[PDB]
Amino acid sequence: NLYFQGMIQSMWFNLHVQDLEKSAQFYKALGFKINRNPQKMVGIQIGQTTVILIENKHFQNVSQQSLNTEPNEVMISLGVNTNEEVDQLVNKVKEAGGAVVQEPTVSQGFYGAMFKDLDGHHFNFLVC
């Protein structure tokens, strides 16, 4: 029902990337499902949560604003079942060319780790 559901049907995220193919390769290495719809963007997905990766110049044009040199607006959390899996995933981030800012440890009552992708986007693995 319109009154109960409201006027906003869905919500999804868009991130800027310098190189679509290099980013798609980084996320594919991490086990993300990569979607390429031909109808200059790549879709990354975990379960049913969707992130659209948009090439830098196109993102700048659509946002009508310049990009940040060191972006720190968002923190993307990634739920993981075990501590051992976070340890494996952190090594996969290092091999894929990402930067590990916080090595696996217990922080704020949870075991986890924190890293940046190829474009400085912050992610945190969380055992939950």
| Distance, CA of 100 to CA of 61 (rounded, Å) | 30
In terms of Cα–Cα distance, which of 116, 70, 76 is closest to 93?
116
The tokens describing 103, both together, are 């090595």
For 25, the domain range is: 1-128
Can you give the resolution of this entry in Å? 2.3
Using what technique was this structure determined?
Answer: X-ray
Q: Three-class SS of residue 6?
A: coil
Residue 112 near residue 86 (C-beta atoms within 8 A): yes
- Cα 126 to Cα 10, 12, 89, 93, distances in angstroms: 25, 21, 11, 15
| Distance, CA of 60 to CA of 92 (rounded, Å) | 30
Total tally of structural domains belonging to the chain: 1
- Other CB atoms within 10 A of residue 89 CB: 19
| Distance, CA of 128 to CA of 117 (rounded, Å) | 22
The tokens describing 113, both together, are 């780790």
CATH of the domain at 21: 3.10.180.10
- Other CB atoms within 10 A of residue 104 CB: 20
